[PDB]
A paper describes a structure:
Multimerization of IN is functionally imperative and provides a forthcoming therapeutic target. Allosteric inhibitors of IN bind to non-catalytic sites and prevent correct multimerization not only restricting viral integration but also the assembly and maturation of viral particles. Within a functional IN tetramer, the NTD and CTD of one dimer wrap around an extended α-helix (α4) of CCD of a second dimer ([Fig fig1]), an interdomain-docking platform that is functionally imperative. Here, we report an allosteric [name] targeting an unexploited [name]-docking platform of retroviral IN.
We derived a peptide (WSYFYDGSYSYYDYESY) mostly representing the CDR3 sequence (underlined) with the addition of Trp (for UV-Vis absorbance) and Ser-Tyr (representing CDR2 extension in wrapping around α4). To characterize the peptide binding site(s), we solved the 2.0 Å crystal structure of [name]-1 IN CCD in complex with the peptide ([Table tbl1]). Except for the C-terminal pair of residues (Ser-Tyr), well-defined electron densities show binding of the peptide molecule to two sites, which we call site-1 and site-2 ([Fig fig2]). Site-1 is at the tetrameic interface and is formed by a CTD from a flanking protomer docking at the carboxyl-terminus of CCD α4 of an inner protomer ([Fig fig2] & [Fig fig1]). Forming site-2 is the docking of a CTD of another flanking protomer into the amino-terminus of the same α4 ([Fig fig2]). The surface area buried upon peptide binding at site-2 is ~ 100 Å^2^ larger than that at site-1 (744 as compared to 650 Å^2^). Peptide binding at site-2 also involves a higher number of interacting residues at the interface (26 as compared to 17 at site-1). Side chains of two residues of the peptide (Trp1 and Tyr3 at site-1 and Ser10 and Tyr14 at site-2) participate in direct hydrogen bonds with the CCD (to side chains of Glu69 and Asp167 at site-1, and to carbonyl oxygen of Val79 and Ala80 at site-2). Superimposing the CCD-peptide structure onto that of the [name]-1 intasome reveals potential steric interference with the CCD docking platform of CTD but not NTD at site-1 ([Fig fig2], top). Therefore, peptide binding at either of these sites, or both, would inhibit CTD interactions with CCD, and can rationalize the observed inhibition of IN multimerization ([Fig fig1]) and strand-transfer activity ([Fig fig1]).
Author numbering:
A (entry chain B), B (entry chain B): 1 to 15
C (entry chain A), D (entry chain A): 57 to 139, 148 to 188, 193 to 208
The structure:
Amino acid sequence: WSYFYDGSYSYYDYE
Amino acid sequence: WSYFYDGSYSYYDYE
Amino acid sequence: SPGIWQLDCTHLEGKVILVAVHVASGYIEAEVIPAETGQETAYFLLKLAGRWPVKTIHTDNGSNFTGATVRAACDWAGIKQEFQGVVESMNKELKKIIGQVRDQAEHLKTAVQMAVFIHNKKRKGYSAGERIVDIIATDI
Amino acid sequence: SPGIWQLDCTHLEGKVILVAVHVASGYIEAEVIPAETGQETAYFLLKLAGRWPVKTIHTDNGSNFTGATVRAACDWAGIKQEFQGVVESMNKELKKIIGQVRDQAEHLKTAVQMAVFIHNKKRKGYSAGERIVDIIATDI
């Protein structure tokens, strides 16, 4: 998963 | 409070 | 001995308390868990293992220490399981301290952590909290 | 420095994560808390203080670190409060590790403790988990 600066996140691994 | 060998307890301090 | 722990499950006020005792130091960690399940025991163990070199745990054979979720956490953290009156000595000592402070805490869970504190910080040279880190530090 | 900690409150998956960083070692403790309240922060701090010599905590000025229940726990445990990019360095490092293991955990809370473990156990001589006990052991 990917956790962003704002509280949001993605199940996808962008990095 | 006092906690006994069985699961029971008392609010009173007997010891 | 730097990494041997005893884990037990006891009951206070109709709730479940998980107790870990570092046998060599007498250091204690404890928590009130929602239910006597493997899931909650696995969580507790995972937290324990990230703080201390936990190598072996001795438990009884209750379903919360033998379940599938506990086995996986120990595999992942690298903890061997095994299934003394050290447990009873500590449960009695902990209950006595909890009884003495309970009135100062709105909730059992707070009183438990007050008792753990009092226990780990009390001297007789070297509290149990100082002894555990000295044991480990020496093992490096 | 043996007893200085940085505490922060961050958000993942729409939940609240409490992070304590022992500044001198980089050792981390973290927990998913039900709500961003003083009550839950006081519980976490009480647990922290029974494990480690916690003398001073640096926090921001959020209502969860300045509330009445937090002030009392710090009085009782004997912790002075104060109100760096050390916090941000650790929150970013922790989020990165959580992202990488999240698929192996049914729940965020488990992934958090897996990431704390991975962080505290990784070497570069002396992990952060070894460094904290060596710092403290030396201070005795």
